[PDB]
Write a protein that binds this ligand. Structure first.
Ligand SMILES: Nc1ncnc2c1ncn2[C@@H]1O[C@H](COP(=O)(O)OP(=O)(O)OP(=O)(O)O)[C@@H](O)[C@H]1O
Ligand SMILES: Nc1ncnc2c1ncn2[C@@H]1O[C@H](COP(=O)(O)OP(=O)(O)OP(=O)(O)O)[C@@H](O)[C@H]1O
Ligand SMILES: [Mg+2]
Ligand SMILES: [Mg+2]
Lengths: 118, 384, 236, 391, 284, 249, 244, 51
């Protein structure tokens, strides 16, 4: 998530089980489902457990970078959304307008948000 | 620029796919396996030599059917019936046997050149934010067109039916045309586009069959978005008056009501209509629940044009001379197609020079040609 | 001729009044704001055309009495008819009732004037809208009225008509205060100049201002004056 | 320019070429149907094949001669035929299709009549489960329908005890957006009779007299069908009033208009054909397709009351997640006299405002915005006064 | 001077002479002036000063031969020559953002041109350019990519050491390490904090995956819980059913009561018991 | 729009209905009017109008729809007010003429009926008198008054040329939502203040803005004080005392 | 009857507009080019005839130039037939003003009166407008030399230099480029002839196709000399400027 | 003729007298004339209104 280019560590048990004929023993492995992504929420010194707003962009136009980067247009959404996957992966920050400055940027990363109010 | 490496990388993925594909077909596609050999053998033993295209009128549930061949004679045909008794339906193309005509098999699909006009091969090289500007009346077209395809999950929290339909209306040149083509690049679902001047025909009876068709194809593929461009064209375009006229126009409208919503319960046909004659439409057309959020577009304001003009001049050569802000000053609530015709005509000034620089002079000059269009079909000068 | 040029519409209207309103939308833009002791009418003039004599040509603000001004938007040709009728009525009042008109009475008269060419046969309405402003005599309350080709009349705190009046109207909600006008004349003037520069743009030569102060003082500020005011607004 | 453009030109054209080449070499496939639960069919499939038992030239009776028959084939070619030993003589009827031997013409197996209809098999429709409770209100206009159409299918006993002729026809009319067709989808749920649905503009063809065939045959196919209902939808075109033009092109349309009359009364009654006409307009209709003996009771469908909107909106908001303590009464009052199709859209546009605030719920606030949204567009639009006079 | 067709094709040729040469120095065994396809040397103080001088010019307005020089040498030394020039140019000659795009465009683009040993060596310099620049937010992402413990500590130190107080800096450090759900960062940062000595209770948790437990509860409350499992006794159909309940309760969900009925747990047999209790764990 | 009509080429032409189409149209222009509610009791008649602001820049205390005919007759106009401009002048003239001829107060009914004679003069030139209109008026009046021979009267004057005596009547856009309530809440045991607050009640529900004394206006006709327009302060007091009794439920 | 056939030509369009006015303006661009240039010393009115034949008499022709009074003359472009009526009405108004005040009419008053007359036809009556455009050259003591143009709507505007009829826009650009703030009557004559030379529909511009008149302050101490030239004087000044 | 749909508009005039001679000259290559005939004389006898 931090790097979409990175390969997982906890999700490798999902990857593991395809080279072997199915058995009840393999069925035991599958109860694990880790690989999870956190829902990003803005943070403060007192700990805010919700987001404020975010921008999301389905289609970039930039081919000078493999994924491009979300320009300042995105579809705006409100609080309380889990990280959006492919078909929604470029995620821009909407916090500038409330006189707050993001300290922790976003692209579609797993990372939580934190903001500073003037 | 500087994207050479990624294009080589894409190309490299292409080399590897072409390679392994080719060799896999060639000689190691091994048909020395019996589940390939034995299935084709006894399939060809009942299957022809001449395969006698027929047209299935209707079926009988005693393992028989009546076909009418385009050559002429009908036949009361049997059916070998390893082909799944109930998988074939009126309008099918069936394979008859060169001896006693039995339905050897069934062709899955066939098509018309009249649905070629409907369907599309295109993949626009413009994606959204080449519609940059008017960026809050475009949340009414990507929250009821794009989004329920992308997330039905949001509309499940609230429950009840998801959105259906839009009508776009406003001044011409304010982007209506490109709005429809921009959501279709995002969604990647069957994009049908049909002009309203082909829904108006000089022959009657085939008018309704065309209009009935669009949505029947559209429902047939599970997702589709049907762009009817110019439903303002149904009262202003008409050929002769003895096979056109009131009658032609009334019927087609009537057909569309059944199709658009009616009683068909056809597949997903998200509808987009462009129009600026919205009062030549029925009250059962502009009825709610076929239009859910309707979008009004008016001319941009001064600071909106700044958004529009910067999109258009990024593709062009620039200098420090160029000043966009004073081109905005001159125009006053005009369309973005006017702005777009200044930048297109600015390179026509550069073409005329055969000088590849674009300068503030080229943008100001084409500004005057653009304003020449507005007020010289006018002959008052000052408002009389 | 006694045949109607006015047909009743099943919509609840008369088509020609709608068409008149449109005509008035295509017209040049006028702004009216009244201070506490003044009235200010600002008007756009298209002096974009060159080699125009402007000395001999009447401004788009016409004095109808020594203390009552009329500005207009819409058909320029048509307005002159209203203007003649109104000057006439102004003298009639002094003749039979003695004491120059009051703004309200004159406004009412103009209202009836434009109304009549609706309801009568053989005539079409005027597509002209007026801003009538001024003072009553023996009084110092600025009174600013607006009449519209519907034959309906209105009082306003501030108002605007003409082309793209909506933009300036939104500006006025936000830069003029129902409770408080700008008390100095100059500040009022500059508020209206700042308003005009929204749409008028393209230099300070298309702007015209007439200012009226009670005691019958109608004066129109020349281009030089406006240049100074505008440049101040520009710097700030 | 930049020192890559000279080769970006070539690299990019290579992308375009290789996609075409991959697709071309990979090849395509087009199914020629089979079935995996079948892998042996030719143990006695060859008896249907190769050793004919036989497929047959389809014909049509033109003359019964009392004690041979005259058939004219579809290959137009006339022959004289008789009776095999799988035929019954009592079973030949005029205009019936028969199968005859492809070699020596003799009747083997008679066949259903009339191969000319093939587009009436696509207007036969299964009953959509829009449910019978789905319809708004517990108002009384749909209960009139339950007396004319629905109940004599369930119980012709009570109409036999009465002895009356049971009413068959009924007119559905009134403003759109009232769910004109939505109550007929409900009634299609309950009665479980055949529904055959017609579009009035689907009855008009390129050449005249072609639609005469259509209508006539459609009716008689419904006569054979037992316990059926024909739902005449949107027959404002064909179905309209009769008048003269003297040079028109309306005449050719009015032919099929007439064809609708001559089958309803007929020279035989409708044997359990219940008939609905759905018209947007009573403002123009035929006076013999609106004669009161063949459309028997005609029900005006109305606008919801100030109670009726509360009932509809409760069907709609009970289907939506809203947070309790709300008034369905209040929202009806705020609206003028209006449609429920607006009420179906007050919920859904209030839900788009619900997602905008990112609620899982819907509250009072977003309902208010929605009510304003629809009303304002209604004024911007036709049919805030359109009824085209009469009552 | 005034853009036209001519220089749009000619000027690429100027740059290409130097270009070709540097590439040819790896492939050939003759190497710069003994290769006669150019008859020019890439070394000296005659052409090497031409490359550098070109680089400053083409950097200011455009990006032309600048990325391209680095990779053709094959050395991290090349990337460090550019580090110096850009880090001055980071703010005044063009904005930070434009610089960030330059750096990541070099690494992501040249990946199929950078075998493992080359690729890591290039990412080190990229890390340094960010560390020079203001965004320590960019530094952490790239250091994790390298995977070196040293650099993780270095970005953490950059916020920690300057301030003698908790300031935004310590909240931000804890977040930067929090992101990895691998948690290699988490262990490292927890013990730097004990050394620095501020509040332990908030900081160590926040670096760790503890606070991520807390927000999952806030999200669960909105989500809800659903149970739709089957259940029939005695066969592989019973074994299936009891596993299914946890498969519907993946992630933290609330199903306390269903677990409390130990009946069905025992009615699975053999290995089935093992997998039955295992699916109970996924509820929490 | 463009509702199907066989006749719009005459202004006096039939109409397979059997009635005039233009008159019909006229009554469909009273449904856009700003709501005027009028409660008639046996103790006075109360006329309430929503003044209808359209901008906060618009001064709405210098516009009003209450128009005095004479001391003992008041009138409220709803619909198209440019037409009412003419009609109200005519009515004032008529009243003054009666007092010239007879030194007497004019009957409320006689006056209403005179203005109905005015309404029916549309035409191209027909019956014994000259048509000086060409299209009918699209404005309806609530003429309230008191005469000493029948007491308090409230009349609804139509652009048709027809007049109905009402005991309470609402016109305007919100006229149906008001009249439903009139049918239930009205009786003949009301008092003046009870009817006054009833008006403010039903005006609340047809309020499209908010109720206060800056978009709402009351006026009364009483026998021994004549026609009196309530100033804004007094109106405010009544609105607040409504809010007191609204929070007592 | 008669309402049947009534066309209703004084109603608005959906534009708020009058087709008849537009159509009249359209038909005047079929009529000749008339030009007025104001010098600081006088006014030049230069009009190009529409018809020219070697059988046409052009020696009694004043088809375009008319004296309204011996201070104010006009150049006429459009329908001649309608224009004639307005011309005699204008003269009558001039003499009326002179009658009741015994003092010559300002240019203001006359231009406006005519504008009102045109306005009446568009305003009511069901009539078509008078399709004429006037360029007024006048001298009064209050504003001095005055140049005016008025159009079939019944609207007037003052100008420093103006062209009406055919190729309005072209001649206007020309006049922009070649105008001086103060000029002589000779300089003005030169500019006028030149502008008509570059806008004339026949390859050559000739005296027999020119109507040419001035009002000049040659006459001194507050007298103005009108001159309606002879074609033989137009000939000579046409050779002066070197066209022929 | 709406914005951005049409961007070059080519008006064609009737022929000049130099252009009208040029069309005549093409035609004379098909024919066999006599020497001493001027086609600039012919183009002046004509005036045309079209090609
Ligand atoms: N608001 C806008 N933002 C960005 N680009 C715009 C905008 N408006 C217009 N354009 C540009 O102008 C173009 C011409 O527009 P198009 O031809 O799609 O306009 P239109 O409104 O559809 O025209 P019509 O009125 O003829 O239907 C578009 O292709 C688009 O790139
Ligand atoms: N009475 C009702 N109760 C509940 N929902 C209704 C009702 N009437 C209409 N609807 C809703 O509105 C939707 C559309 O209405 P419908 O298409 O049935 O209109 P119609 O009456 O057939 O009009 P027309 O045929 O003239 O277009 C239905 O699918 C349903 O969701
Ligand atoms: Mg388009
Ligand atoms: Mg229907």
């Amino acid at each position: 998530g931090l790097l979409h280019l990175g390969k997982g560590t906890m999700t490798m048990d999902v990857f593991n089980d395809a080279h072997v004929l199915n058995k009840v023993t393999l069925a035991s492995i599958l109860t694990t489902a880790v690989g999870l992504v956190s829902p990003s929420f803005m943070l403060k010194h007192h700990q805010l457990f919700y987001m404020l707003n975010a921008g999301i962009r389905p289609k970039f136009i930039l081919a000078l970078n493999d994924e491009g980067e979300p320009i300042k247009v995105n579809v705006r959404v409100g609080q309380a959304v889990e990280t959006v996957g492919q078909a929604g992966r470029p995620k821009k920050i909407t916090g500038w307008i409330t006189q707050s400055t993001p300290v922790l940027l976003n692209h579609g990363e797993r990372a939580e948000l934190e903001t500073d109010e003037y | 620029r500087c994207k050479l490496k990624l294009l080589r990388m894409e190309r490299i993925k292409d080399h590897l796919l072409l390679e392994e594909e080719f060799v896999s077909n060639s000689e190691i596609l091994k048909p020395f396996e019996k589940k390939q050999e034995e299935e084709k053998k006894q399939l060809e033993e009942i299957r022809g030599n001449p395969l006698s295209i027929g047209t299935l009128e209707e079926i009988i549930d005693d393992d028989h059917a009546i076909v009418t061949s385009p050559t002429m004679p009908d036949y009361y045909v049997s059916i070998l019936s390893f082909v799944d008794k109930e998988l074939l339906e009126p309008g099918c193309s069936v394979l008859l046997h060169h001896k006693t005509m039995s339905i050897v098999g069934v062709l899955q699909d066939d098509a018309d050149p009249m649905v070629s006009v409907m369907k599309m091969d295109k993949s626009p090289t413009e994606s959204y934010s080449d519609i940059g500007g008017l960026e809050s009346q475009i949340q009414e077209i990507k929250e009821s067109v794009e989004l329920p395809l992308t997330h039905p999950e949001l509309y499940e929290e609230m429950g009840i039916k998801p959105p259906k339909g839009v009508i776009l209306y406003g001044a011409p040149g304010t982007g209506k045309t490109l709005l429809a083509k921009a959501v279709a690049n995002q969604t990647s679902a069957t994009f049908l586009r049909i002009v309203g001047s082909e829904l108006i025909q000089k022959y009657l009876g085939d008018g309704p069959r065309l209009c009935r068709q669009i949505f029947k194809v559209a429902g047939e593929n599970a997702p589709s978005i049907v762009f009817i461009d110019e439903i303002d064209a149904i009262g202003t375009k008409r050929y002769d008056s003895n096979s056109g006229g009131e009658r032609e126009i009334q019927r087609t409208m009537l057909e569309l009501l059944n199709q658009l919503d009616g009683f068909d319960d056809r597949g997903d046909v998200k509808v987009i209509m462009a129009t600026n004659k919205i009062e030549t439409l029925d009250p059962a057309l502009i009825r709610p629940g076929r239009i859910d959020r309707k979008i009004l577009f008016e001319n941009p304001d001064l600071s909106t044009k700044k958004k529009i003009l910067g999109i258009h001049t990024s593709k062009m050569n620039l200098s420090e001379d160029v000043n966009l802000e004073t081109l905005v000053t001159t125009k006053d609530d005009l369309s973005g197609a006017d702005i777009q015709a200044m930048c297109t005509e600015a390179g026509l000034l550069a073409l005329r020079e055969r000088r590849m620089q674009v300068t503030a002079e080229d943008f100001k000059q084409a500004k005057e040609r653009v304003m020449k269009n507005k007020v010289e079909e006018n002959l008052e000068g000052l408002y009389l | 001729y006694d045949r109607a040029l006015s047909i009743f519409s099943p919509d609840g209207h008369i088509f020609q009044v709608e068409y008149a309103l449109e005509a008035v939308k295509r017209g040049t833009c006028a702004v009216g704001v009244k201070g506490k002791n003044c009235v200010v009418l600002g008007c756009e003039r298209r002096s974009t055309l060159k080699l125009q004599d402007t000395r001999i040509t009447p401004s788009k603000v016409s004095k109808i009495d020594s203390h009552v001004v009329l500005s207009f938007s819409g058909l320029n040709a048509d307005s002159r008819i209203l203007i003649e009728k109104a000057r006439v009525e102004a003298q009639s009042h002094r003749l039979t009732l003695e004491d120059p008109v009051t703004v309200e009475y004159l406004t009412r008269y103009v209202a009836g004037v434009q109304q009549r060419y609706t309801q009568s046969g053989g005539v079409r309405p005027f597509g002209v809208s007026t801003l009538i402003a001024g003072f009553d005599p023996r009084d110092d309350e600025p009174k600013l009225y607006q009449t519209e080709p519907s034959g309906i009349y209105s009082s306003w705190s501030a108002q605007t008509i003409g082309r793209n009046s909506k933009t300036v109207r939104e500006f006025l909600e936000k830069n003029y205060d129902r409770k408080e006008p700008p008390a100095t004349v100059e500040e009022c003037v500059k508020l209206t100049v700042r308003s005009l520069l929204e749409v008028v743009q393209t230099g300070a030569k298309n702007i015209e201002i007439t200012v009226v102060k009670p005691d019958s003082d109608i004066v129109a500020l020349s281009s030089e004056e406006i240049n100074q005011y505008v440049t101040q607004i520009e710097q700030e | 320019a930049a020192p890559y453009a000279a080769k970006l030109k070539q690299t990019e054209n290579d992308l375009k070429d290789i996609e075409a080449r991959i697709k071309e070499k990979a090849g395509v496939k087009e199914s020629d149907t089979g079935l995996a639960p079948s892998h042996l069919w030719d143990i006695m499939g060859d008896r249907q094949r190769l050793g004919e038992e036989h497929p047959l030239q389809v014909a049509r009776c033109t003359k019964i001669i009392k004690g041979k028959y005259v058939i004219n084939l579809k290959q137009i070619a006339k022959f004289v035929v008789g009776l095999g030993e799988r035929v019954r003589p009592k079973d030949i009827e005029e205009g019936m299709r028969v199968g005859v031997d492809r070699s020596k013409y003799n009747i083997e197996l008679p066949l259903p009549p009339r191969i000319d209809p093939s587009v009436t098999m696509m207007t036969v429709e299964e009953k959509p489960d829009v449910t019978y409770s789905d319809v708004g209100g517990c108002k009384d206009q749909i209960e009139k329908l339950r007396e004319v159409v629905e109940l004599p299918l369930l119980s012709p006993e009570r109409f036999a005890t009465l002895g009356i002729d049971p009413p068959k026809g009924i007119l559905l009319y009134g403003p759109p957006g009232t769910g004109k067709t939505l109550c007929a989808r409900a009634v299609a749920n309950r009665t479980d009779a055949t529904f055959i649905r017609v579009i009035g503009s689907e009855l008009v063809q390129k050449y005249v007299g072609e639609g005469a065939r259509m209508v006539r045959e459609l009716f008689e196919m419904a006569r054979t069908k037992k316990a059926c209902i024909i739902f005449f939808d949107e027959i404002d075109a064909v179905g309209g009033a009769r008048f003269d033009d003297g040079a028109g092109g309306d005449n050719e349309v009015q032919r099929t208009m007439l064809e609708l009359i001559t089958q309803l009364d007929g020279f035989d009654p409708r044997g359990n054909i219940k008939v609905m006409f759905a018209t947007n307009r009573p403002n123009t209709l035929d006076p013999a397709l609106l004669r009161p003996g063949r459309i028997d009771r005609k029900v005006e469908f109305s606008l919801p009351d100030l109670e009726g909107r509360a009932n509809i909106f409760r069907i709609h908001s009970k289907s939506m997640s809203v947070e309790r303590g709300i008034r369905w009464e209040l929202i009806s009052r705020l609206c003028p006299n209006s449609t429920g199709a607006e009420l179906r859209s007050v919920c859904t546009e209030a839900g788009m405002f619900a997602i905008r605030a990112r609620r899982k719920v819907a509250t009072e606030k977003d309902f208010l915005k929605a009510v304003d949204k629809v009303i304002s567009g209604y004024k911007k639009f036709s049919s805030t006064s359109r009824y085209m006079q009469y009552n | 001077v005034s853009d036209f067709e001519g220089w749009g094709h000619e000027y690429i040729r100027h740059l290409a002479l130097e270009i070709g040469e540097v590439y040819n120095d790896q492939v050939e065994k003759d190497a710069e002036d003994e290769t006669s396809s150019d008859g020019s040397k890439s070394d000296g103080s005659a052409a090497t000063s031409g490359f550098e001088f070109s680089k400053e010019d083409t950097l200011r307005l455009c990006l032309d031969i600048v990325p391209y020089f680095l990779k053709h040498n094959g050395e991290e030394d090349a990337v460090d020559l550019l580090l110096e020039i850009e880090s001055i140019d980071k703010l005044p000659q063009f904005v930070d953002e434009n610089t960030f795009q330059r750096v990541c465009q070099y690494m992501v683009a040249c990946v199929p041109l950078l075998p493992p040993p080359e690729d890591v060596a290039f990412l080190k310099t990229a890390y340094s350019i960010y560390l020079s620049q203001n965004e320590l937010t960019d530094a952490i992402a790239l250091a994790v990519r390298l995977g070196e413990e040293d650099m993780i500590r270095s970005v953490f130190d950059a916020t920690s050491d300057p301030v003698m107080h908790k300031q935004l800096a310590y909240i931000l450090a804890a977040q930067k390490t929090s992101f990895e759900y691998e948690g290699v960062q988490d262990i490292i940062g927890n013990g730097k904090l004990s050394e620095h000595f501020l509040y332990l209770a908030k900081e160590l948790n926040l670096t760790g995956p503890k606070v991520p437990e807390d927000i999952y509860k806030s999200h669960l409350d909105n989500s809800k819980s659903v149970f739709s499992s089957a259940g029939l006794d005695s066969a592989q159909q019973n074994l299936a059913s009891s596993f299914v309940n946890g498969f519907l309760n993946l992630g933290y969900c609330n199903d306390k009561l269903i677990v409390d009925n130990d009946n069905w747990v025992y009615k699975t047999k053999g290995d089935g018991m093992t997998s039955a209790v295992a699916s109970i764990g996924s509820i929490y | 729009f463009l509702t199907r009509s066989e006749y719009d080429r005459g202004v006096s032409t039939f109409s397979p209905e059997g009635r005039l189409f233009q008159v019909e149209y006229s009554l469909e222009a009273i449904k856009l009017g700003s709501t005027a509610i009028g409660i008639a009791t046996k103790e006075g008649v109360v006329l309430g109008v929503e003044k209808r602001a359209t901008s906060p820049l618009l001064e709405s205390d210098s516009i009003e729809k209450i128009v005095e005919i004479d001391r003992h007759i008041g009138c409220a106009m709803s619909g198209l007010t440019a037409d009412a401009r003419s009609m109200i002048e005519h009515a004032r003239t008529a009243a003054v003429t009666h007092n010239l001829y007879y030194d007497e107060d004019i009957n409320v009914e006689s006056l209403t009926q005179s203005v109905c004679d005015l309404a029916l003069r549309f035409g191209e030139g027909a019956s014994g008198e000259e048509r000086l209109m060409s299209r009918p008026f699209g404005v309806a009046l609530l003429i309230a008054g008191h005469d000493a021979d029948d007491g308090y009267q409230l009349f609804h004057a139509e652009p048709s040329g027809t007049f109905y005596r009402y005991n309470a009547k609402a016109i305007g856009s919100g006229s149906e939502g008001a009249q439903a309530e009139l049918l239930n809440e009205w009786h003949s045991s009301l008092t003046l203040k009870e009817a006054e607050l009833l008006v403010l009640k039903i005006l609340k529900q047809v309020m499209e803005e908010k109720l206060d004394e800056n978009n709402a206006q009351l006026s009364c006709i009483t026998k021994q004080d004549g026609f009196k327009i309530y100033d804004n302060e007094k109106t405010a007091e009544l609105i607040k005392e409504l809010k007191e009794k609204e929070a007592a439920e | 009857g008669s309402r049947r056939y009534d066309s209703r030509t004084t109603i608005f369009s959906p534009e708020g507009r009058l087709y008849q006015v537009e159509y009249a303006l359209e038909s005047i661009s079929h009529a000749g080019t008339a030009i007025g240039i104001m010098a600081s010393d006088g006014i030049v009115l230069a009009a190009e005839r529409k018809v020219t034949s070697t059988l046409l008499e052009q020696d009694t022709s004043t088809e375009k130039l008319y004296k309204l009074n011996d201070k104010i003359a006009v150049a006429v472009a459009g329908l001649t037939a309608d224009a004639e009526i307005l011309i005699n009405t204008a003269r009558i108004h001039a003499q009326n003003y002179l009658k009741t005040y015994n003092e010559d009419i300002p240019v203001e008053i006359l231009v406006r009166r005519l504008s009102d007359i045109k306005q009446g036809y568009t305003q009511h009556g069901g009539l078509r407008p008078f399709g004429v455009s006037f360029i007024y050259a006048g001298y009064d003591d209050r504003y001095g030399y005055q140049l005016y143009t008025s159009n079939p709507s019944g609207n007037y505007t003052g100008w420093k230099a103006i062209s009406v009829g055919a190729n309005t826009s072209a001649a206007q650009t020309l006049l922009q480029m070649d105008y001086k703030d103060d000029m002589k009557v000779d300089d003005a004559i030169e500019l006028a002839l030149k502008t008509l030379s570059k806008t004339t529909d026949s390859s050559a511009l000739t005296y027999d196709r020119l109507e040419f008149a001035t009002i000049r302050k040659g006459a001194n101490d507050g007298e103005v000399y009108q001159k309606i030239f002879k074609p033989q004087e137009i000939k000579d000044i046409l050779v002066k400027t070197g066209i022929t | 003729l709406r914005p951005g749909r049409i961007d070059r508009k080519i008006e064609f005039p009737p022929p000049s007298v130099a252009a009208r001679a040029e069309i005549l000259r093409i035609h004379s290559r098909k024919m066999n004339l006599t020497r001493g005939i001027n086609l600039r004389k012919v183009a002046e006898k004509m005036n045309g209104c079209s090609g």
